[PDB]
Amino acid sequence: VQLEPNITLVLKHLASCGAVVSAEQQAALDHSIPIKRIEAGLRSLTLWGRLTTLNGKDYLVAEGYNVASSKEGAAVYETKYFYSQDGARWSDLQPVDSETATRCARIKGMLSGDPAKNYELELVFQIPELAVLRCRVDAIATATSVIPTDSTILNAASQVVPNRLFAGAAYPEKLESYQHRFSLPGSGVTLSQDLRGTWAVQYDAFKGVAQVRSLLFPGYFFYYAANELTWGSLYVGDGLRNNDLIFML
Amino acid sequence: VQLEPNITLVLKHLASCGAVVSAEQQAALDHSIPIKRIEAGLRSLTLWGRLTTLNGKDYLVAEGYNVASSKEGAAVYETKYFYSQDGARWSDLQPVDSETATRCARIKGMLSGDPAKNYELELVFQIPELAVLRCRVDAIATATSVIPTDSTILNAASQVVPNRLFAGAAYPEKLESYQHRFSLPGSGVTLSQDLRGTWAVQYDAFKGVAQVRSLLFPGYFFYYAANELTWGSLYVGDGLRNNDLIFML
Amino acid sequence: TYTYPNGDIYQGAFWAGKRHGKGMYHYKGPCCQLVGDWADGGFTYGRWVYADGSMFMGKFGGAAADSKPTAGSYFYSSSSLVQEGHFAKDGSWVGHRDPAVGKEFSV
């Protein structure tokens, strides 16, 4: 039914889970999301998340794509990520090559504010902080991008497009009603096929709203309201990974 | 696109037009609209407006309908109204007769908060205050109930229903892009076949948001967002139409 | 059978005043059991079982400098997860693969 999640509805439904942004930053977002959506050629630019930092200048990260195709048995989106400290002026996040993509996953810690920070590894490897930020965003998006099943569909020329006749998911408390965004529409892959204890679902059946929380990445929340058929997802907190899931559960 | 209007969207988009609802009432509506919707059995129920009363307490009025039919060449909605002073308990707003409505018509000025006051008219007639409230509300509703053009369509069994695959109003800064709720989707009767100066439209092309203000009833505001096909209407103020409209123009 | 002052009970084989060979040791307090092969009064290989059903099967450090586990597989009964790995040092547990649903280690 919906074609792009709102920022206001998402920030309203996920407020209870701590997924909130400052009010001045909220107004700046309201003004400066369309500006970036028009400056860049994108046609769907939403807010992805907000990563914390050693300063107060958290990283607000937005994501936008033009084309979304079906390549090699996977729905692939040519995503582009932007970051900002305040909601006013956005900058871009260039992708990182594989050598850095492997040398950036060993840098556990909380990111600092200035995006001109260099971490050191071992000879010494000097890595920029924006590379680490992009690595963390890519990992979280690979592990957590959640949408209701059958919300997308395949057309001619093999483009994944919103299912304009989507009638919602029956049993919105079962994990079988949600799927990764990069699963092809025909495939029966859902969040159930992931590790059993990774995802937690709390479903308010009276107000008809379901919340899916990631336990492997503790700061990722997703909401799905069935009566109005609106689904959104945000990530608040840093992008570190919960390795010892077996002990916590 | 959208199935039912969102209260937070209405309050966010119509805030510039001075159509606001207090914080306590905001939270109380958020928690109490679903309860009354479920108790009554209505598929849709939403805040219709806020009529201001003499003393501090105000009248919040909500309306709800189950299904809208197509009868006698018009879209007939069987609506039921509820009123409240606080946003917690929703009592019923009873329908009134014809001659009693004519007597409501001669009651002017701001009505008082107490729902037990009785007005005096002329042989003397005793007019209950809730009757005056209902008379004003139904007058405003039957005058101005805006919906974007062709956003609803007929179906089998002839019940007007939301049009799931809706392109969006083209040329949305013109009255032809909007219509009355009770106008059939097929007919070309739109918001332009009424008096020439009773409506005003403001448009932001970058944000893609249109605001429609009723001039016959100054407190009726409507918004339509183009990027996300969401529209909503709200009434704020006492239920008096300015009969001295021409001199205003 | 040696009943210790703390309530811990060792049942099994002895050799020259120590625990040796097959033996099983029940702790008082934390109802956890060490079952398997003992050498010089210390655990070497076998299964460490908690009070609910979760356990750890593998090779432990001997009497040498402690009986701490060294390598093997954890299984947690609450989530049915199983993970193979080893304790690198300072207690840090490093696993070889992501956890996967499994069952208890019934030799």
Give an overview of the whole structure.
Chain C: Keywords: Repeat. The structure is cut from a larger assembly and holds 2 copies of chain A (249 residues) and 1 copy of chain C (107 residues). Chain A is α+β, with helices and mostly antiparallel strands. The longest helix of chain A is centred in the N-terminal third of the chain and has 17 residues, at 23-39. Chain A has a 4-stranded antiparallel β-sheet. Chain A has 5 helices and 14 strands. Chain A has helices at residues 8-13, 23-39, 98-103, 129-144, 245-248, and strands spanning 45-51, 59-71, 74-84, 91-93, 118-121, 125-128, 146-148, 152-154, 160-162, 178-180, 199-204, 209-214, 220-225, 230-235. Chain C is mostly beta strands and 107 residues long. Helix content of chain C is 0%, strand content 53%. Chain C is built from no helices and 10 strands. In chain C, strands 1, 2, 3, 4, 5, 6, 7, 8, 9 and 10 form a 10-stranded antiparallel β-sheet that branches. In chain C, a hairpin with a 2-residue loop joins strand 4 and strand 5 (42-49).
- Sketch the topology of chain C as an H/E string, one letter per element: EEEEEEEEEE
Strand content of chain C: over 45%
Name the chain pair with the biggest interface and residue counts per chain.
A-B, 17 and 18 residues
Q: Which strand-content bin applies to the residues of chain A?
A: 25-35%
Q: Biggest β-sheet of chain C: count, sense, barrel?
A: 10 strands, antiparallel
Q: Name the shape of chain A in a single word.
A: globular
The H/E string of chain A reads HHEEEEHEEHEEEEEEEEH
Q: Categorize the overall geometry of chain C.
A: globular
Family (chains A, B): Belongs to the flagellar radial spoke RSP9 family.
Subcellular location (chains A, B): Cell projection, Kinocilium; Cytoplasm, Cytoskeleton, Flagellum axoneme
GO cellular component, one term (chains A, B): axoneme
Disulfide bonds (chains A, B): 104-135
